[PDB]
Design a protein around this ligand. Structure first.
Ligand SMILES: COC[C@@]1(C(=O)Nc2ccc3[nH]nc(-c4ccnc(C5CC5)c4)c3c2)CCN(CC(=O)N2CC=C(c3ccc(-c4ncccn4)cc3)CC2)C1
Length: 326
């Protein structure tokens, strides 16, 4: 009865037909499909998380957040398919917009132009404005989580790690998280850097090597950065560390644009309190030809702690997808 992709039941018909393998990952499998009802191309992805709570946790964030968000530079959810009773729900099928590819695949095939880089960056920070304006952190910004259509339109995906802000992949992890909302800007910076060099800038093997890469290019932190840390054991680590001189951006990036390296700097500042916020990164000279606060929306309804048994999450998951059932 049901369609099937690489020996994987896709029980999404009769509405969704002509299914085609796009990719896979720990999450599940993603597919291109035809919506026979709205007569348009979509992406369906089959998730099977009900065994372990952290899967249930990521499933529910993904759904909660994306249903609640509407933005031009954020992948929405269109429809969601799941069994009509909670006992029999083993899988969720989340239908979203179809796109051509992600930034990860794009970088592996082409060195981009300052034209491609200025626009992509503009759209990222645009997306991020909405997200932060909802008091919400993505927490996992990176190339493979920025989707592209043939029109060079960029959309941000995967809110599996999303949280509400509340001060109480490694290569894009901000330095404060190896020690103890700006954490997104550091990712956006590391992404800017990769788009410049077609190389990940800070490719650490482990959490300590990650720092060494970071301090390798920034040099050792200043007095006031060290202060604004308040972790002692962490800070004690940093002190124990041989002095390393700041690399000027333009020696790592010779053929790169003067204005962008000025934005990268304010983006990759060690001190989280000093680092540029989205609002301003937008207002930076490098994005002068794009920056338009009229055309740069903010969440109308800003936002939720769920460390619960996988049975209550399965309930909430069922509850949140209810709106798609007769
Ligand atoms: C990176 O974007 C990939 C995830 C993302 O959304 N993909 C995605 C979404 C919409 C899309 N439209 N068009 C394309 C598309 C079209 C064409 N070419 C591409 C690129 C060439 C690849 C992409 C596309 C791709 C896939 C799912 N994910 C978010 C997610 O679904 N959630 C967060 C994580 C969850 C989860 C993770 C792991 C497990 C689990 N792990 C181990 C065992 C069991 N379960 C369970 C749930 C479930 C909920 C981010």
């Amino acid at each position: 009865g049901p369609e099937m992709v690489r020996g994987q039941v896709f029980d999404v018909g009769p509405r969704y037909t002509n299914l085609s393998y796009i990719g896979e990952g720990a999450y599940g499998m993603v597919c291109s499909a035809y919506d026979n009802v709205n007569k348009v191309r979509v992406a369906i992805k089959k998730i099977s998380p009900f065994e372990h709570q952290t899967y249930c946790q990521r499933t529910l964030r993904e759904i909660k957040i994306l249903l609640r968000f509407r933005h031009e530079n954020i992948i929405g959810i269109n429809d969601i398919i799941r069994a009509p009773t909670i006992e029999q729900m083993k899988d969720v099928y989340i239908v979203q917009d179809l796109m051509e590819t992600d930034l990860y695949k794009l970088l592996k095939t082409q060195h981009l132009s300052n034209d491609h880089i200025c626009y992509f960056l503009y759209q990222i920070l645009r997306g991020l404005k909405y997200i932060h304006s909802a008091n919400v952190l993505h927490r996992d910004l990176k190339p493979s989580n920025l989707l592209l259509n043939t029109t060079c339109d960029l959309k941000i995906c995967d809110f599996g790690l999303a949280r509400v802000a509340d001060p109480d992949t490694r290569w894009y992890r901000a330095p404060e998280i190896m020690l103890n909302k700006s954490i997104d800007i550091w990712s956006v910076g590391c992404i800017l850097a990769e788009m410049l060099s077609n190389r990940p800038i800070f490719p650490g093997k482990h959490y300590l090597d990650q720092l060494n890469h970071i301090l390798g290019i920034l040099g050792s932190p200043s007095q006031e950065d060290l202060n604004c840390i308040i972790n002692l054991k962490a800070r004690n680590y940093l002190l124990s560390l041989p002095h390393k001189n700041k690399v000027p951006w333009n020696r790592l990036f010779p053929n790169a644009d003067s204005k962008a390296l000025d934005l990268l700097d304010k983006m990759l500042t060690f001190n989280p309190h000093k680092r540029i916020e989205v609002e301003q990164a937008l207002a930076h000279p490098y994005l002068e030809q794009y920056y338009d606060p009229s055309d740069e929306p903010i969440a109308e309804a800003p936002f939720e702690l769920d460390d619960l048994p996988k049975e209550k999450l399965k309930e909430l998951i069922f509850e949140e997808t209810a709106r798609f059932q007769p």
